[PDB]
Amino acid sequence: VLYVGSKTKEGVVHGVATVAEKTKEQVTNVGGAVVTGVTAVAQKTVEGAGSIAAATGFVKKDQ
Amino acid sequence: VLYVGSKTKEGVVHGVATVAEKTKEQVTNVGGAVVTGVTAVAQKTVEGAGSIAAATGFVKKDQ
Amino acid sequence: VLYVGSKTKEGVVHGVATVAEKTKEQVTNVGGAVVTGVTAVAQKTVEGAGSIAAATGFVKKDQ
Amino acid sequence: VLYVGSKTKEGVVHGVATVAEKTKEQVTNVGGAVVTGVTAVAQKTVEGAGSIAAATGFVKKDQ
Amino acid sequence: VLYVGSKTKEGVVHGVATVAEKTKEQVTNVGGAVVTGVTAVAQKTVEGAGSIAAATGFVKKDQ
Amino acid sequence: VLYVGSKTKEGVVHGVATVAEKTKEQVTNVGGAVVTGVTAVAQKTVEGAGSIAAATGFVKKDQ
């Protein structure tokens, strides 16, 4: 018995109950980015950059 | 018994109950990006960049 | 018994119950990108960049 | 326009999301009654006795 | 316009999200009554006795 | 416009989110009554006796 990786739990979501009552919901975007309504998300990365809900703007490079 | 990778659980979502009552819901986009309504998502990456709900804008490169 | 990869669970979604009542739902796009309504999605990548719901804008390269 | 019975809603269940993870579940009965696991039930009675989940025991009448 | 019964809502359940994780669950009954696990139930009665989850015992009548 | 019964809401349950994690749960009954786990229940009665979760014992009548 070495158990280098034994019974683990990483990057895990469980047992989520959610209600959302909304009569009106609007999103208006003119350029850029909008991220809305992220729920019950799990991720695991090995040797990388992990972004869950990352809104980024204009990425310009002018020479 | 070495169990290098034994009984694990990574990048996992389980047991999610969700209700969403919305009489109206609009999204208006003019250029750029919009990400909405991501639920119960799981991902695992090995040697890579993992993005779940990533809205990015204009990626320009001018020379 | 070496069990290098034993009984594992990665990039997994299970046991999801979802209700969505919406009388009206509109999406208006004029250029760019829109991603909406992603639910119960699982992915695993090995040596790659994994994106689940990634809206990206104008990717220009001018010389 | 009299609208004696207009747009009503009585004895109604709507928009229910439910998850139930149970590895083991036993019921042992020796006489009597057992009622278990009633979900999302609606009833309307007019001039009567309405019982949804009513477990009753030995109803004896000896003379 | 009299609207004796106009737009009403009585005996109504809506928008319920529920999760239940139970590794073991036992019920042992020896005579009598047991009522368990009633969820999202609606009832309306007119001129009657309404019981939702009513466990009653031995109803004896001896003469 | 008389609006004897206008837009009302009576005996109503809405917008309930519930999680319940229980590794073990036992009920042992020997005669009598047991009522457990009633959630999100609505009732309306007109000219009657309304009981939601009413456990009653031995109802004897001896002559």
Swiss-Prot record, chains A, B, C, D, E, F:
Lineage: Eukaryota, Metazoa, Chordata, Craniata, Vertebrata
Residue runs in coiled coils: none
Official protein name in the record: Alpha-synuclein
Impact after mutating residue 17 to T: In PARK1; no effect on osmotic stress-induced phosphorylation; increases oligomerization
Modified residues (Phosphoserine): 51
Source organism per UniProt: Homo sapiens
Disease / disorder: Genetic alterations of SNCA resulting in aberrant polymerization into fibrils, are associated with several neurodegenerative diseases (synucleinopathies). SNCA fibrillar aggregates represent the major non A-beta component of Alzheimer disease amyloid plaque, and a major component of Lewy body inclusions. They are also found within Lewy body (LB)-like intraneuronal inclusions, glial inclusions and axonal spheroids in neurodegeneration with brain iron accumulation type 1. Parkinson disease 1, autosomal dominant: A complex neurodegenerative disorder characterized by bradykinesia, resting tremor, muscular rigidity and postural instability. Additional features are characteristic postural abnormalities, dysautonomia, dystonic cramps, and dementia. The pathology of Parkinson disease involves the loss of dopaminergic neurons in the substantia nigra and the presence of Lewy bodies (intraneuronal accumulations of aggregated proteins), in surviving neurons in various areas of the brain.
Subcellular location per the Swiss-Prot or TrEMBL entry: Cytoplasm; Membrane; Nucleus; Synapse
Function field: Neuronal protein that plays several roles in synaptic activity such as regulation of synaptic vesicle trafficking and subsequent neurotransmitter release. Participates as a monomer in synaptic vesicle exocytosis by enhancing vesicle priming, fusion and dilation of exocytotic fusion pores. Mechanistically, acts by increasing local Ca(2+) release from microdomains which is essential for the enhancement of ATP-induced exocytosis.
PTM description: Phosphorylated, predominantly on serine residues. Phosphorylation by CK1 appears to occur on residues distinct from the residue phosphorylated by other kinases. Hallmark lesions of neurodegenerative synucleinopathies contain alpha-synuclein that is modified by nitration of tyrosine residues and possibly by dityrosine cross-linking to generated stable oligomers.
Sequence repeats: 6-20, 21-31
Recorded family membership: Belongs to the synuclein family.
Binding site for Cu cation: 14
Tissue expression pattern: Highly expressed in presynaptic terminals in the central nervous system. Expressed principally in brain.
